[PDB]
Amino acid sequence: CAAYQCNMEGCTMSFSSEKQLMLHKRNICPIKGCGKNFFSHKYLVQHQRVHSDDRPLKCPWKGCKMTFKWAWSRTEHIRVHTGARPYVCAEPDCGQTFRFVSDFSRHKRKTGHS
Ligand SMILES: [Zn+2]
Ligand SMILES: [Zn+2]
Ligand SMILES: [Zn+2]
Ligand SMILES: [Zn+2]
């Protein structure tokens, strides 16, 4: 089509004109009114995702209006609705359960438990 695609390895961005593609190749932010410049294309791509508030993945639980960027975040969230606590501590006199793996990992660090 009329769009100008970026040819940098891994990049999926496209632009209305060659002008904006050239500015993109100079690692200038694509967002109107930002103007920030970056040392590499890696730094540029990391930055522009901060401007995004797009959360494409909706919670499937009826009544819930929450939305998510990543599938793992949505999957973890659904456990709040189901009450699932998949991670159980292995120590003899603890028996503590966790909803998210990061909470289970935090418990193993803070207290010396299996
Ligand atoms: Zn690019
Ligand atoms: Zn920016
Ligand atoms: Zn939900
Ligand atoms: Zn424990």
From Swiss-Prot:
Residues binding Zn(2+) 1: 6, 11, 24, 41
Zinc finger regions, C2H2-type: 4-27, 27-51, 57-81, 87-113
Induction data: Induced by abscisic acid (ABA) during seed germination. Induced by dehydroabietinal-dependent (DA), a diterpenoid tricyclic diterpene that promotes flowering and systemic acquired resistance (SAR). Up-regulated by heat stress (at 30 degrees Celsius) and remains up-regulated transgenerationally in the unstressed progeny (at 22 degrees Celsius), partly via a heritable feedback loop involving HSFA2.
Annotated positions binding Zn(2+) 3: 59, 64, 77, 81
Recorded family membership: Belongs to the JHDM3 histone demethylase family.
Subunit structure: Forms homooligomers. Interacts with BZR2 (via N-terminus). Interacts with BRM in the SWI/SNF complex. Interacts (via N-terminus) with NFYC9. Associates with INO80.
Stated role: Histone demethylase that demethylates 'Lys-27' (H3K27me) of histone H3, thus acting as a positive regulator of gene expression. Demethylates both tri- (H3K27me3) and di-methylated (H3K27me2) H3K27me. Also demethylates H3K4me3/2 and H3K36me3/2 in an in vitro assay. Involved in the transcriptional regulation of hundreds of genes regulating developmental patterning and responses to various stimuli. Binds DNA via its four zinc fingers in a sequence-specific manner, 5'-CTCTG(C/T)T(C/T)-3' (5'-CTCTGYTY-3'), with a preference for hypo-methylated status (e.g.
Name of this chain's protein: Lysine-specific demethylase REF6
Encoding gene, per UniProt annotation: REF6
Entire protein: shown range: 1240 to 1353 of 1360
